[PDB]
Amino acid sequence: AFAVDAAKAYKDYLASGGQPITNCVKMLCTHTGTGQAITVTPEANMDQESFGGASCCLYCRCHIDHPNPKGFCDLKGKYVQIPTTCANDPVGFTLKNTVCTVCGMWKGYGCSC
Amino acid sequence: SSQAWQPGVAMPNLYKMQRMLLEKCDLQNYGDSATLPKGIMMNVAKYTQLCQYLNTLTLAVPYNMRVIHFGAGSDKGVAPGTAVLRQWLPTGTLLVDSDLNDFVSDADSTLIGDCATVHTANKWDLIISDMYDPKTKNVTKENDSKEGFFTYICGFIQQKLALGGSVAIKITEHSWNADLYKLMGHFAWWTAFVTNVNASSSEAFLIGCNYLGKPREQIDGYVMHANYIFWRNTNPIQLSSYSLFDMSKFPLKLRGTAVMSLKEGQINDMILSLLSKGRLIIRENNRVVISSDVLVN
Ligand SMILES: Nc1ncnc2c1ncn2[C@@H]1O[C@H](C[C@@H](N)CC[C@H](N)C(=O)O)[C@@H](O)[C@H]1O
Ligand SMILES: [Zn+2]
Ligand SMILES: [Zn+2]
């Protein structure tokens, strides 16, 4: 029955005024991309930065099991677009937000559905 | 300095043709540092400029390309160069990386441990190595050709690089190997490329373009490294991050280069010419299988 909840631990750590995880790999890009959340290549638009997926996944970064039966990681090997306003904490952003399964934009950060 | 707008500077041919003696490397711009775009890591920029330069060579780019990246881990626990390589390579490229220490990677598969423990069944279209041991930079002893991972690399290139494949191996004033320079003579073309963001360093990437599997040119590695040091000593390179700001043409153009299985008897001069122009890769196309030897005790 026992399982470690790293997501809530990091959220509480942030609330406690903690230093956000650093050294997420920001990519060079045109910044004229589709703005979608998770892509096969950097897709940041004028308002986004693109990071290497693995470097912004809490589970990859902390060396813990991914929270699902497959252990599958949806960021590793891809590129994640982060609003420039939140690019200081990409791990926290990806953790706290959700991707629209129809248009592929961040819900509340580019999704107009 | 119109080189400032290029991704870097390649060793001019005339410097390759000299017969210099090894000297200490004393860079005029030593300590200078290019101003990187906000929040961009040095290694992201370095790999980006390396890839921008490779875009100008006749790299074979087959479907289902195979790229292996040694020395991919950083002291941060992530793999910036691997992220840049995945961005640069065509979608669907099989990318394997490795490093002595554990790290988080965007590669299709990652092997941790000494380069010497890595084995692969298949051959590769592109080999990148950023492996570096900072204990080599000792200015109180002779600067002699180094072994260690370099040995491995050489072997790897000769055993597991497809004909027509290419390599970029990082070297410095003290991190170098004579046999690697000698191997450069087994490619259709070769150079030493210095990225503009890291021009203040003796670092360079030994680039071998279009592997031929045999020497087309006899290169003395000691003399060639002395030539490289002479070039760097007499040609100050202006630190520059300009090329980082235009990524519109960054992706490696998918060329669909043909891949043929051939026995060595079949590599005639027509085949060698096709190899030398980046128009042919010679290797099998079975599944990619890799492993890392584990010593038990
Ligand atoms: N014999 C070896 N086998 C495998 N890796 C090695 C060996 N010697 C040194 N290295 C690695 O070379 C790396 C040098 C790093 N500066 C590479 C930086 C990294 N490529 C980056 O993108 O930031 C270290 O991570 C070491 O683990
Ligand atoms: Zn992950
Ligand atoms: Zn939507």
Residue numbers in the entry:
A (entry chain B): 18 to 130
B (entry chain A): 1 to 297
Please quote the paper that reports this structure.
Nsp14 and nsp16 are responsible for the methylation of the cap on the guanine of the GTP and the C2′ hydroxyl group of the following nucleotide, respectively. Both nsp14 and nsp16 are S-adenosylmethionine (SAM)-dependent methyltransferases (MTases) and seem to be essential for the viral lifecycle. Enzymatic activities of both these MTases (nsp14 and nsp16) are significantly enhanced by nsp10, which is a necessary cofactor for their proper function. In this study, we have structurally analyzed SARS-CoV-2 2′-O-ribose methyltransferase, an essential enzyme involved in RNA cap formation which ensures stability of the viral RNA because non-methylated RNA located in cytoplasm is prone to degradation and cannot be efficiently translated.
Here we report on the crystal structure of SARS-CoV-2 nsp10-nsp16 in complex with sinefungin, a pan- MTase inhibitor originally isolated from Streptomyces griseoleus. Eventually we obtained crystals that diffracted to 2.4 Å resolution. The structure was solved by molecular replacement and revealed a mixed alpha-beta fold with sinefungin bound in a central canyon. Sinefungin is bound in the SAM binding pocket that is localized in a canyon within nsp16. The nucleoside forms hydrogen bonds with several residues including Asp99, Asn101, and Asp114 while the amino acid part is recognized by Asn43, Asp130, and Lys170. These six residues are absolutely conserved among SARS-CoV-2, SARS and MERS highlighting the importance of RNA methylation for coronaviruses. A key feature of the nsp10 fold are two zinc binding sites. The nsp10-nsp16 dimer interface is 1983 Å2 large and it is formed by the nsp10 helices α2, α3, α4 and a coiled-coil region connecting helix α1 and the sheet β1 (residues Asn40 to Thr49) and the inner side of the nsp16 J-motif including sheets β4 and helices α3, α4, and α10. According to the model, the first nucleoside, 7N-methylated guanosine is bound in the upper part of the RNA binding canyon while the second nucleoside is positioned in the central part of the canyon in a way that its ribose ring gets in close proximity to the amino group of sinefungin, which in this case represents the methyl group to be transferred structurally explaining how nsp16 performs 2′-O methylation. Our analysis revealed overall fold similarity between SARS and SARS-CoV-2 nsp10-nsp16 complexes (RMSD = 0.747) and also a high conservation of the SAM binding site among coronaviruses, in fact, all the residues that are involved in ligand-hydrogen bonding are absolutely conserved between SARS, SARS-CoV-2, and MERS.
